[PDB]
Write an enzyme that holds these catalytic residues in place. Structure first.
Site, PDB file in Angstrom:
ATOM      1  N   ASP A  44       0.847  -1.292  -0.025  1.00  0.00           N
ATOM      2  CA  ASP A  44       0.200   0.024  -0.130  1.00  0.00           C
ATOM      3  C   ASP A  44       1.031   1.335  -0.072  1.00  0.00           C
ATOM      4  OD1 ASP A  44      -1.904   2.111   0.264  1.00  0.00           O
ATOM      5  OD2 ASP A  44      -2.545   1.255   2.375  1.00  0.00           O
ATOM      6  N   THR A  77      -3.703   4.833  -5.224  1.00  0.00           N
ATOM      7  CA  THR A  77      -2.781   5.292  -4.464  1.00  0.00           C
ATOM      8  C   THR A  77      -1.508   5.100  -4.854  1.00  0.00           C
ATOM      9  OG1 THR A  77      -2.925   3.581  -3.087  1.00  0.00           O
ATOM     10  CG2 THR A  77      -4.551   5.449  -2.620  1.00  0.00           C
ATOM     11  N   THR A  78      -1.090   4.200  -5.379  1.00  0.00           N
ATOM     12  CA  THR A  78       0.441   3.930  -5.768  1.00  0.00           C
ATOM     13  C   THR A  78       0.359   4.856  -7.224  1.00  0.00           C
ATOM     14  OG1 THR A  78       0.615   1.962  -4.748  1.00  0.00           O
ATOM     15  CG2 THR A  78       2.219   2.313  -6.423  1.00  0.00           C
ATOM     16  N   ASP A 360     -12.909  -1.295  -0.844  1.00  0.00           N
ATOM     17  CA  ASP A 360     -12.813  -0.978  -2.200  1.00  0.00           C
ATOM     18  C   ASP A 360     -13.862  -1.400  -3.254  1.00  0.00           C
ATOM     19  OD1 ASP A 360     -10.092   0.023  -1.662  1.00  0.00           O
ATOM     20  OD2 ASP A 360      -9.083  -1.663  -2.118  1.00  0.00           O
TER      21      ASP A 360
END
Lengths: 480, 502, 504, 429
Positions: A44, A77-78, A360
């Site tokens: 994450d 997010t990455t 998610d």
């Protein structure tokens, strides 16, 4: 002022390139050893940047960008960190050509708005009335989690929960009204929607407690049943004023200061059949004030009947190691019918990852509420934008004409990383995608891999303003 | 001199790149680094950063004065003051000019800069029929809680004509207020005759035609008003009066200078003895008494006089005049109503109350009512921006730079370079070439085309009237006045004394 | 460090002789290793050449200063001082720009042209009472005739040279004097003519008189193109197709011939020949074809007629043309001659010398150029202008006129040139012991607009009228320093990188 | 810092003037100088100190050129001119702190030097060369500084009668290099022969055949050479030969240069004398012959009579004489102080500092003599107010020629000017 910006870009590029190796499930995991001795391992990007304790002031902005990425879209997010570092890496040669950052900043915001219309034309328009694509979207997204066969049963439960609260013009929906309560025991196959409300704890296990009541009123009360700090006389007036408003459900906020309910008060409440639920967390105080439409009551004089809710039936469901209390039929016209799902399982590691998996799953469905349509991942939306910007860059004039050529080159970093983390050759796979682009467009559909459009849209929007705010600071000084 | 000039530039560099909507931002970092923030506010950055430079604390009080007037333009004050101190380095080495003479050159340049912006200033007051009608409705809203709320039409009408009829400065110094007793508030009227309480003369007539007014302050009657402590040594009683009689003969020297001016009206704060007053009867000179302070200054403004009390040379002075002086009597007291004042612009609202409580409440409420009407003159009135007004001021400075002495030649010319620095910095943050835009803007306005400006969107010179980009005129004067006062102290500094920590 | 050595390194060397400008300037000692061989002098060129300079940029300034000594030899120090002030203004233009100085160099050429025009209107001369100067000019011309075959008759030859100088009223260059020489004649028969005379008359049936003739310069071959056809592969079915290719190449020339009539000119000049077909069309269009123009005579004709020379056509109805009223075709000495007369503002003369052989012709022309060069030297000699900082400030305000209409990036380049012109009174006031900021400030304000005779007065330490005190400076010194300092600044700016020279 | 480089040379120049200041006057302090070659010499003469000092400072070497011109023109005051030069440099130190450019400082010295000469000539008594009684007592006082005293009475008319013959009228500069002091071993001081025609440095031929004497010689009777058989060949022709002529006297004889040529030897000299040249272009060059027994006699006498010719040389070029001892320097400082108000601007303040710089010469004379420094200087301004040139040095036979005081101020104005005009120095080769 270039020495301050170039030092921040190089420092931010090393952080973005480090997170770049963590893209995808096959990516390289980063290890962080805290000073206390705790070591965490995960892919994450938001968890790594939060526990890294970066001392660089500009590099800390990636935490706020990753926070809004998971709060709005819920995924990428990455990828948003990689796109942020891609624009900073291409901006190194822009400063050597004598380009002022205002043109660089204004071009990213103008290109981000035009990139959305390009994706919408290539995207397939879908509607929320069809439940075929809604179930398949949440079912395939759970292939990355331990649950496999039970993922098909939880797919329609998450679809029917969002469609009720989505409406039409509501657009963004607050995710705080959806509370996932995990408890040891039970199984995944046993689920209850309970649209009225769900608490986080059990009921009184002592003797005399009815634990079940029909047609009762629920309200928030910050008071506490304690002796004076003769005892039965002081507790008599407390329960007498509650009987005036006919409130059979007492919710006491959890506090380590004093106790909750005295044992002498349990015998008085047993005759009136007044159910009491203690150990109410502080986070649930704001939650219960929304779905139930009630108000927190500090003192006994502030307690009124108009601030009390309504409950058709309040009972304690019998379950192994669970004993969950449910409330149905809140009968509140002002408050909207939110959904709180109870998570059950034997192992503690089950109900934990199951809660994160449902986060998610609800975000991807919520992405269709704001903007309908979906675009398959795997580098398709990143390369498709660069295809349209090739001929469009020739139609520009001035300094901005060169930015459109470098903007399409920075978008190729995302599909290149996906090919590297899978072991395949970086350039070789990318050339095979652009070769067939003359015939195929979106073709990944047969592999049941789907991604919402808001993730690809928010990744460009957040990275555009991020890099924009980086070049705005030309000096760093000490202020205290 | 380095800390007051170069050291002050580093303080101004923090607000230099933050000027304008496209300007850059600064970072304020603490020891923990987690409390930081990003903002473009200039007043927040200067107050948050501790300044070890003792000369930098002077600019701190300058920003506080600017924030009192209006909360906009605080950043531009430090930036404009930094450009004047940056060019001060060349004013020493290769120039060697006294710093006060450089400051006096700014006062001559600022006088022409404010006059250049006035002629080029525009306003939304067009179609005054709708604008002048709404002025009386605003004054009626301010009458709440005030005793003037009894009649809205008559009381607010006197305040409306007290503003537009001025045709000049809207400050209360041009409005005279008189508090009298024995009447009703409904009988009040607007009169420009400059009514005051006291009378003058006894057997002199009450009407004067073609009067010449001169303002002076002196004591012609019995000086050294305190006689206690003196010692009179005389051989006889009659010899003691010789000193008083000798003073009367010396009074002819002061009267002769007045008689050569050919004035029938004189202004005196103190009294006048009968003998110098009797000599004024043959010459036809009337003296007015009890002029206070405002009465001395406001008389020189309406009649075009001077406030100096001494004569530096005969037949050279600033003289006023009025056509007719009429003396009437109302409320059992004589009044003085002037008539036919040359270029007289003023108004006097006479408030006639029934007691002392109604007079103080009406005067304080009228000042607040006229303040809103006078604010509309400085509000909504704008000027052409986008480098226009900054370049136009440079043309007025070059006019004064033509005829000048040798000391202020380089001082006035250096001020014109700092005016062009404002569009230069704004063009830097816009992402375009500042040297190309500022250069082409000066050559265009030099001959004709005074309305041209710099367009930030297209990066070229365009008409500011068609684009509709304007900036408030009150903001222009507030920055120039603040920069003139801030640079006046700093340039005079030959040494730095560190302030004591509180 | 490339431009720093050419600026900071040059200013450090330039400031050495900067304080020595003027008789009241400073002095400098030149010390050697043994220190007993030293000397003191005020010469600026001696200090620069004697001091060894390891800076490779400073070695160029030494070679530039040698041009002023060989050409004239006066005001050598003033050239280095003015060139050093140009580097001070150019250094501020670069560091604030960082753009190639060649653009700034173009701004100096436009500013230097306006400075030379301002000095011409205010220039005076000692040529008054020419009656005394004319009697000395004929006596000096007879002295040069010694040892030369022209010494046979001094009165006739010196009279022709007298009317060939004072009647010019313009440039003294020999390009305004045409030399025509023929055989089978006497030297005493030489006459003076104000026209431009050719030989080898043009055309056969062309008229001998042309009224209101125009002059155009062009280079083309209208007759017998394709000089060398050997080596090119020729594939043709018939022989007649070879001549058809040459006609097609000359057919495209009709567009250029049509542009000749559009220029409104009645006469065309070409160096090569012209075929009969394009020449026959010149009669119907009223076009005259002049031949044997060569090169020299082409350049001398465009200057006296106010024209220009070009070998190509850039665009129709755009060109600089001359004119002549009457062209007469006569014949003398058994050779056809041409006569051009009636030129607008034409200033020139022609001396026709008749020799008895080819040896007497070459000796008469070479001896005439050396005799006229000495007499024409007095035109630029003794002629002075008003000095005392006046003319220095006149050049300053003339540059400010160019600052009105100017480009965006060329404004600072031209404006900085006017600042360097005002550095001359600043240096002279510091060397004389006065206040430069006080004098220059009051000097520019008065000379700014009109009616300013004021100048720098070093006796009273204030600004006084130089015309009353009789302070003047030579005009030749003004043009020599400005032209040398302008070329000196171009050499240093056109060099971007300076490699360190080998230390000796 | 262009001015700070010059200020470093001014401080170094004032240190040299302070060293020579202690050597002023006969009672001054001597200076010991050790040469690099090992020679140890000491003396109070300022010209010999600066010559062997080997100053490496570029600006400080200007005092050597001024001291060389001081002895070549006036002949006296080589020590005092160094003190006067350092006085203007010390006063100019405060002028640079006020922002005054050295050009005004240097230009004001030209007007101050010319004004000081006109003021000095007003108080000076004009004398003529026709009076021989004044020239005898003038040269006799200059001989009181040497061991020879009683024998100096006969040396006074020797130097007076030699100059009066070549003085004529309006001669302006009179070169003393044409007057040669002949130093020979033997004889005494009282024995001297003028020989107004010329005097050589060499003897005659001591071999056989040399005539050594010839009448009506120039057909070459007498020749000069810069073999023994050549002497015998010219002996039959009656031609006198003089060989071994010094190379230094070649240029000397080409300037000054016979009825009778003979060789007269008092004792051991064997010298040839020539009289009655009677040349139209060439003047009457006289060479003084000095005789003495010990070497220290003719040596100290040479420097004593050379200074006596310089004092007479000053009277020929500029008539008039003043009393020495710093007497006129006091009145000049008084007149220039009052006349300083007649000027205006920066130059007016220079006249006040220029008057104070002239008082260092009389102050040093009072310091080196043991008297109180400030006390004697105050007595000079007091007595010179009522009287004029009465303080008494006239009774003490102290007479300083006016040209020395004039040249000392003139050379100091040019020396200080050449200093302040140097704003920098660099290596040049």
């Amino acid at each position: 002022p270039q020495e301050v910006r170039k030092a921040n870009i190089i420092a931010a590029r090393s952080v973005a390139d480090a997170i770049r190796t963590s893209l995808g499930p096959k990516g390289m995991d980063k290890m962080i050893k805290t000073s206390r001795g705790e070591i965490i391992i995960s892919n994450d990007g938001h968890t790594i940047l939060k526990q890294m304790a970066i001392l660089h002031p500009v590099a800390r902005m990636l935490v706020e960008v990753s926070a809004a990425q998971d709060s709005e879209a819920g995924d990428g997010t990455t990828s948003v960190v990689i796109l942020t570092g891609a624009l900073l890496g291409a901006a190194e040669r822009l400063l050597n050509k004598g380009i002022h950052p205002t043109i660089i900043a204004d071009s990213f915001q103008s290109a981000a708005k035009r990139s959305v219309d390009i994706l919408l034309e290539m995207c397939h328009k879908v509607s929320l009335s069809d439940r075929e694509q809604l179930v398949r979207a949440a079912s395939t997204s759970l292939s990355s989690k331990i649950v496999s066969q039970y993922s098909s049963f939880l797919a329609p439960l998450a679809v029917d929960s969002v469609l009720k609260i989505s409406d039409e013009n509501s657009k963004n929906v607050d995710l705080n009204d959806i509370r996932l309560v995990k408890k040891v025991g039970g199984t995944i196959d046993d689920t209850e929607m309970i649209d009225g409300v769900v608490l986080t704890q059990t009921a009184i296990k002592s003797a005399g407690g009815p634990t079940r009541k029909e047609k009762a009123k629920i309200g928030l009360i910050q008071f506490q049943i304690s002796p004076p700090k003769e005892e039965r006389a002081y507790l008599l007036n407390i329960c007498k004023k509650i009987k005036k408003a006919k409130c059979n459900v007492l919710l006491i906020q959890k506090s380590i200061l004093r106790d909750a309910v005295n044992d002498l008060a349990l015998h008085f409440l047993s005759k009136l059949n007044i159910m009491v639920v203690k150990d109410i967390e502080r986070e649930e105080i704001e939650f219960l004030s929304k779905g139930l439409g009630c108000k927190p009551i500090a003192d006994i004089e502030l307690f009124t009947e108009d601030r009390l809710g309504s409950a058709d039936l309040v009972e304690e469901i019998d379950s192994d190691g669970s004993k969950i209390v449910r409330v149905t039929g809140i009968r509140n016209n002002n408050a909207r019918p939110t959904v709180s799902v109870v998570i059950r399982g034997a192992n503690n590691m089950i109900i934990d990852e199951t809660e994160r998996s449902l986060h998610d799953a609800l975000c991807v469905i919520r992405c269709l509420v704001k903007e309908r349509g979906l675009i398959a991942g795997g580098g398709a939306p990143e390369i498709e934008i660069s295809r349209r910007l090739s001929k469009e860059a020739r139609s520009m004039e001035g300094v901005q004409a060169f930015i459109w050529q470098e903007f399409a080159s920075a978008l190729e970093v995302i599909p290149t990383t996906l090919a590297e983390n899978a072991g395949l050759n970086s350039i070789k796979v990318v050339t095979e995608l652009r070769s067939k682009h003359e015939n195929g467009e979106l073709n990944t559909y047969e592999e049941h891999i789907l991604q919402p459009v808001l993730v690809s849209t928010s990744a460009i929007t957040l990275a555009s303003e991020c890099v924009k705010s980086i070049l705005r600071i030309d000096d760093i000084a000490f202020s205290r | 001199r380095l800390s007051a000039f170069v050291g002050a530039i580093a303080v101004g560099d923090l607000v230099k790149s933050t000027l304008g909507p496209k300007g850059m931002d600064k970072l304020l970092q603490s020891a923990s680094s987690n409390t930081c923030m990003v903002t473009n506010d200039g007043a927040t950055i200067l107050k948050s950063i501790p300044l070890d430079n003792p000369a930098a604390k002077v600019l701190v009080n300058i920003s506080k004065v600017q924030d009192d007037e209006v909360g906009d333009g605080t950043t531009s004050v430090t930036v404009l003051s930094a450009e004047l101190l940056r060019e001060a380095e060349k004013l020493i080495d290769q120039s060697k000019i006294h710093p006060q003479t450089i400051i006096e050159g700014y006062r001559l340049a600022s006088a022409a800069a404010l006059d250049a912006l006035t002629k080029a200033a525009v306003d939304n007051s067009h179609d005054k029929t709708m604008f002048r009608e709404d002025l009386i409705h605003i004054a009626k809203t301010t009458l709440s809680s005030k005793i003037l709320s009894q009649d809205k039409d008559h009381f607010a009408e006197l305040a409306t004509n007290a503003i537009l009829r001025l045709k000049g400065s809207t400050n209360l110094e041009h409005i005279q207020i008189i508090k009298i007793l024995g009447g009703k508030l409904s009988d009040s009227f607007l009169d420009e005759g400059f009514i005051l309480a006291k009378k003058f003369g006894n057997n002199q007539p009450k009407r004067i035609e073609n009067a010449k007014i001169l303002i002076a302050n002196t004591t012609l009657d019995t000086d050294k008003v305190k006689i206690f402590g003196t010692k009179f040594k005389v051989d006889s009683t009659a010899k003691l009066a010789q000193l008083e009689k000798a003073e009367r003969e010396k009074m002819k020297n002061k009267i002769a200078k007045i008689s050569k001016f050919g004035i029938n009206t004189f202004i005196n704060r103190q009294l006048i003895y009968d003998y110098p007053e009797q000599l004024f009867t043959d010459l036809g000179i009337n003296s007015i008494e009890h002029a206070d302070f405002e009465g001395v200054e406001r008389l020189a403004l309406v009649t075009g006089g001077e406030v100096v009390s001494t004569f530096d040379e005969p037949s050279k002075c600033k003289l006023g005049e009025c056509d007719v002086i009429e003396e009437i009597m109302l409320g059992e007291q004589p009044f003085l109503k002037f008539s036919g004042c040359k270029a007289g612009e003023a108004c006097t609202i006479v408030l006639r109350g029934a007691t002392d409580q109604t007079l103080d409440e009406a005067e304080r409420s009228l000042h607040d009512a006229l303040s809103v009407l006078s604010q509309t003159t400085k509000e909504t009135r704008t000027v052409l921006g986008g480098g226009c007004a900054e370049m136009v001021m440079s043309k007025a400075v070059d006019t004064e730079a033509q005829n000048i002495d040798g000391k202020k030649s380089l001082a006035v010319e250096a001020f014109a370079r700092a005016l062009r620095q404002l569009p230069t910095i704004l063009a830097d943050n816009a992402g375009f070439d500042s040297s190309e835009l500022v250069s082409k803007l000066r050559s265009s306005i030099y001959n004709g085309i005074s309305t041209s400006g710099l367009d930030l969107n297209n990066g070229t010179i365009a008409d500011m009237r068609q684009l509709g980009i304007v900036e408030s005129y009150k903001l222009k004067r507030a920055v120039v006045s603040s920069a003139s006062e801030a640079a006046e102290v700093l340039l005079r500094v030959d040494n730095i004394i560190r302030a004591r920590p509180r």
